[PDB]
Design a protein around this ligand. Structure first.
Ligand SMILES: Nc1ncnc2c1ncn2[C@@H]1O[C@H](COP(=O)(O)OP(=O)(O)OP(=O)(O)O)[C@@H](O)[C@H]1O
Ligand SMILES: CNC(=O)c1cc(Cl)cc(C)c1NC(=O)c1cc(Br)nn1-c1ncccc1Cl
Ligand SMILES: Cn1c(=O)c2c(ncn2C)n(C)c1=O
Ligand SMILES: [Ca+2]
Ligand SMILES: [Zn+2]
Lengths: 447, 281, 146, 49
């Protein structure tokens, strides 16, 4: 069992270093099976309607599409197990980082009580494999030494799942692999992975690829990956939901205006509505109101010139001036304004979202991300802002300070490094400069 | 503590450190002429490692014109002869791996076994203007003779890199700390041109960072970046999380909570390189 | 020069030298340079409009194929939605040009078979490809020109 | 960068330029750190000695 286990971690590691290459071939083969699908044909003749493939001087295309569909479902399943190998330890680590500081600092589950995320997280405090994917594992003794005097300590120990709290603490002071696994922790960890929006998109990608063997026309929806893949065409799709509250009421407003335009047409202008050009077989559409309201919202918002394009002309003397005012105020409202409100609502939503992606780049190229002085102060010396960025205030040096403080001992720290280390563990950020960086206070005494 | 640093400045510590710099500069050019004297020379390089961090811990909380830095530099110009011998030591043995790394000097040797003679490598290093006349017979006297036909440039290069990595880094840190704290000094400007190579070699390994504490005074904090930490920093999976984190802070993130998000971004990247170091081949 | 010497072979080849007015004056060069100033963003939207219309033809090919018939003669029937490469060429030629959707060129859904599926199908096709995506493209050049 | 390699070895390099002693600028600048016979064969200087 030892050789099969190391062959499993060799296959899982070989796949995860090629995670970007594997999805490149997953999209290339996704576009390859939908390019060849353009040559389908329906016929009454055999090869009811049948779906047979047509090709000129090539008979290899039908075994190819059967080969690429099994190759796409295989490569999609390796992508799921790859995302279940690589980024799912990352997505738990940000949640048990936020909760373990939510438990100890402000006390989310000990002094107050709550959101579905607050009550789903109750299944993870009583497992002993709580800090298993976290750098801090003494978090439960942090909060019992903090809030174990104000309340009953036996109740908070039963809340925190600490097995033998008066015996394991004395044992730590002085001195069937699946059956050893916790069933409450893995049902909890499989619950939050299902909350993740990327995995339900990756889960939608695999469940439709396996549905593509039932009908090969189901491979069409994987070419909508170009909308979510590149960031250019995702701002077009996210602009619909960015201002989606304002759009659903305007189409709600357009629904009640057109329904108020059909009721006036149903009571006074009903003899005009007749699309049938045959005299003996008359089809008057304005006889039932649910029939006619479906007729208005299908041709009236599509014609561009109002409802009167599909209706006979008002050359008759009966209701000649009422109708000619009726179509004009209908054309002025639903197409000229309300349909220009909707395209007036998405394109500036599309316009503003790209304006905030360009201003993020511009303000980053101007301000310093750490201290509160612009790039106009550092214009006194040439290349002063790049000297202020790369050498003095760099975001990579602030991490490189941190992991250097992780690796070295507490008895090897100097006074400046032990001061920022004690200020970081109680989580206060007054050690950052924020508006002065060696060129405002010593500006007269350095030349 | 301001009390001890004025007590060490008003004591006779300076003639002790000058005398310790005198015995260190002469023994390392005496103990480098034999291969059985390796244990004493590493123990000495760890000892002058301990003094320069003692000298760096004296310079903590130092004002841009303070008396600790000026009594540190006049101690250096009272003792010019030996600290030029320590920085010439760290120059000639760091330049040689850049010298033996050239395409010319590996083309001047044609032995298949790799044991080059002593006369051919002496005329080769004399052709380059980076090394001088009395320097090269010092380096062949420090090398293994082996009947004047085997110098073994590979083992002579990596011999004094590993014991002299830490001290060669910290005398570079001591010079850059004193230069940017007290400027407009010609004798310190004498010292950086004399030790230019140990600064440019340790520039991507030195990180300069500033924090603000101790009665609202900004100080410059100096630390080390190892080679493994920067090699995993410039990988595409790490910078793609960097590109989106910069985006979600200046666009929708707050002003006071942006440094709380920065440290939450920092601890996440320590973990994602740790899961990357676990999955590395 | 190479097109002016080609103009003696056919004198209609002298037409392309009146495009010098686009590059000569700086006024009409910003109209021509605005296409290539934001040309990366435009080629993906027409790439996005290509895969939405192709996803609109596959739904029409499997469920709405008996509706597509442009022939007004009963004995000689021309059903365009029989081959998919024929029909996808039909959608990107009349559907993005009509201004009111694909249903202008197709018979009305007065029959009971697929009466509510089709009347929702044309509306969400008209809402996407003309009202938004074709206003995205003219929304992309004019502000680039602006 | 690679198309410009065909112009260093011609003697009519500075013929349409105000500076014509550019090759002796760079041999006096980088002729000690490398082999000077190689940089003279790179620069096309016919009979540099
Ligand atoms: N700590 C900082 N404070 C303020 N501004 C910073 C800081 N770090 C970087 N910047 C600014 O943001 C930019 C970030 O550059 P980034 O690494 O994202 O891309 P880049 O410079 O185009 O990379 P490359 O050219 O190496 O591919 C810097 O060039 C600088 O203008
Ligand atoms: C947002 N969709 C995805 O995450 C995605 C998810 C799955 Cl299961 C499969 C594929 C092919 C996906 N699509 C990409 O993964 C992808 C689409 C585009 Br367009 N580009 N692109 C990409 N991006 C970076 C590196 C390599 C690639 Cl291939
Ligand atoms: C290993 N490790 C970490 O990985 C870590 C940390 N603080 C944050 N992190 C992420 N500390 C103190 C630590 O010892
Ligand atoms: Ca210490
Ligand atoms: Zn700054």
């Amino acid at each position: 069992w030892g050789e099969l286990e190391v062959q499993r971690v060799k296959f899982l590691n070989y796949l995860s270093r090629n995670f970007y290459t594997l999805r490149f071939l997953a999209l290339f083969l996704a576009f390859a099976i939908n390019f060849i699908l353009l040559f389908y044909k329906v016929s009454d003749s055999p090869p009811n309607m049948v779906y047979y493939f047509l090709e000129e001087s090539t008979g290899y295309m039908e075994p190819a599409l059967w080969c690429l569909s099994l190759l796409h479902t295989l490569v999609a399943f390796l992508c799921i197990i790859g995302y279940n190998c690589l980024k799912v330890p990352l997505v738990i680590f940000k949640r048990e980082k936020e909760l373990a500081r939510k438990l100890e600092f402000d006390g989310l589950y000990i002094t107050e009580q709550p959101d579905v995320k607050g009550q789903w997280d109750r299944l993870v405090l009583n497992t002993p494999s709580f800090p298993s994917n976290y750098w801090d594992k003494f978090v439960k003794r942090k909060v019992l030494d903090k809030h174990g005097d104000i309340f009953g300590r036996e109740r908070i120990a039963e809340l925190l799942g600490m097995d033998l709290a008066s015996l394991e603490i004395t044992a730590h002071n002085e001195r069937t692999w699946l059956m050893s696994i916790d069933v409450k922790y893995q049902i909890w960890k499989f619950g939050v992975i299902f909350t993740d929006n990327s995995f339900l998109y990756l889960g939608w990608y695999m469940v439709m690829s396996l549905l593509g063997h039932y009908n090969n026309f189901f491979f069409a929806a994987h070419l909508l990956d170009i909308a979510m893949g590149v960031k250019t065409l995702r701002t077009i799709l996210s602009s619909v939901t960015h201002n989606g509250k304002q759009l659903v009421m305007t189409v709600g407003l357009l629904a009640v205006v057109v329904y108020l335009y059909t009721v006036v047409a149903f009571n006074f202008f009903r003899k005009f509505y007749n699309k049938s050009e045959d005299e003996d077989e008359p089809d008057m559409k304005c006889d039932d109101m649910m029939t006619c309201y479906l007729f208005h919202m299908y041709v009236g918002v599509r014609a561009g010139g109002g409802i009167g394009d599909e209706i006979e002309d008002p050359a008759g003397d009966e209701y000649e001036l009422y109708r000619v005012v009726f179509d004009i105020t209908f054309f002025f409202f639903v197409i000229v304004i309300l349909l220009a409100i909707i395209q007036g609502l998405i394109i500036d939503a599309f316009g503003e979202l790209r304006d905030q992606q360009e201003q993020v780049k511009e303000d980053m190229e101007t301000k310093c991300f750490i201290c509160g002085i612009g790039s106009d102060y550092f214009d006194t010396t040439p290349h002063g802002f790049e000297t202020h960025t790369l050498e003095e205030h760099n975001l990579a040096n602030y991490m490189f300070f941190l992991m250097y403080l992780i690796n070295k001992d507490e008895t090897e720290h100097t006074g400046q490094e032990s001061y920022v280390w004690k200020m970081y563990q109680e989580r206060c950020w007054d050690f950052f400069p924020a508006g002065d960086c060696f060129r405002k206070q010593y500006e007269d005494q350095l030349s | 503590c301001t009390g001890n640093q004025q007590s060490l400045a008003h004591s006779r510590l300076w003639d002790a450190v000058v005398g310790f710099l005198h015995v260190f500069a002469h023994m390392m050019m005496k103990l480098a002429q034999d291969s059985s004297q390796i244990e004493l020379l590493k123990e000495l390089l760890d000892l002058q490692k301990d003094m320069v961090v003692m000298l760096l811990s004296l310079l903590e909380g130092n004002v841009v014109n303070g008396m600790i830095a000026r009594q540190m530099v006049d101690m250096l110009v009272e003792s010019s002869s030996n600290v030029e011998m320590i920085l010439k030591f760290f120059d000639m043995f760091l330049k040689l791996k850049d010298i033996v790394g050239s395409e010319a000097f590996q083309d001047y040797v044609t032995d298949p076994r790799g044991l080059i003679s002593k006369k051919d490598f002496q005329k080769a290093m004399d052709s380059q203007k980076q090394f001088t006349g009395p320097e090269i017979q010092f380096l062949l006297s420090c090398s293994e003779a082996d009947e004047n036909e085997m110098i073994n440039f590979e083992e002579f290069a990596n011999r004094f890199q590993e014991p002299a990595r830490d001290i060669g880094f910290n005398v570079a840190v001591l010079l850059t700390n004193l230069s940017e704290h007290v400027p407009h000094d010609p004798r310190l400007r004498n010292f950086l041109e004399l030790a230019e190579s140990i600064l440019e070699y340790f520039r991507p390994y030195l990180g300069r960072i500033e924090i603000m504490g101790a009665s609202r005074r900004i100080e410059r904090i100096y630390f080390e970046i190892s080679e493994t930490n920067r090699a995993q920093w410039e990988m595409p999976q790490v910078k793609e999380s960097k590109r989106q984190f910069i985006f979600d802070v200046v666009n929708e993130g707050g002003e006071a909570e942006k440094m709380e998000l920065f440290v939450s971004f920092c601890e996440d990247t320590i973990f994602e390189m740790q899961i990357a170091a676990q999955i590395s081949e």
